[PDB]
Amino acid sequence: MTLCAMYNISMAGSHPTTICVVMDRFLESFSELYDIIDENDTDVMMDFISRFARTDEIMPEDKTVGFVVVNADKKLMSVSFSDIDENMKKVIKATAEKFKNKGFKVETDM
Numbered sequence: 292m293t294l295c296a297m298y299n300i301s302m303a304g305s306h307p308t309t310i311c312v313v314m315d316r317f318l319e320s321f322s323e324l325y326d327i328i329d330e331n332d333t334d335v336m337m338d339f340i341s342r343f344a345r346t347d348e349i350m351p352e353d354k355t356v357g358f359v360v361v362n363a364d365k366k367l368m369s370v371s372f373s374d375i376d377e378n379m380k381k382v383i384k385a386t387a388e389k390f391k392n393k394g395f396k397v398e399t400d401m
Contacts, residue, residue: 294356296372298344300324303363305333310344314356314374318383321359321370325386328363329393357400366394373400 296317298310312320320343327339357372368390370383384399391397 293350293353294374295353296320296356297358298324299358299360299362300328300340301362301364302328302333302336305336305363307362308336308340310340311346311349312343314372316343317356317372317375318379321383321386324361325389328361328390363394365396367396368394369396369398371398371400 294314296312296314298312298317298320299307300310301307310320323339323343327335356374357370359372360367360369368387370387375383387397387399
């Protein structure tokens with residue numbers, strides 16, 4: 292009965308990074324992403340992907356709550372996840388929208 296999410300992040304020429312984060316830590320991950328994404332620290336990335344994503348033990352029962360495509364090189368932002376509060380959409384959407392400042396490419400799953 293576990294719901295995990297797939298957070299894809301690819302900093303400016305840093306290759307695609309698959310960050311697995313529980314649906315519960317989805318909002319948090321995104322909140323911190325909008326911050327780090329606006330930085331120039333390629334080293335802190337590891338500490339971020341590790342601190343957030345454990346990837347130590349995975350199971351089949353674990354379902355996919357949603358995925359988020361984030362690419363700095365092309366400046367693309369896409370969020371597709373379900374099983375979340377209605378009011379939460381406001382915050383999540385706002386954050387994903389702010390990316391427009393450095394990436395007009397913004398898409399969200401209704």
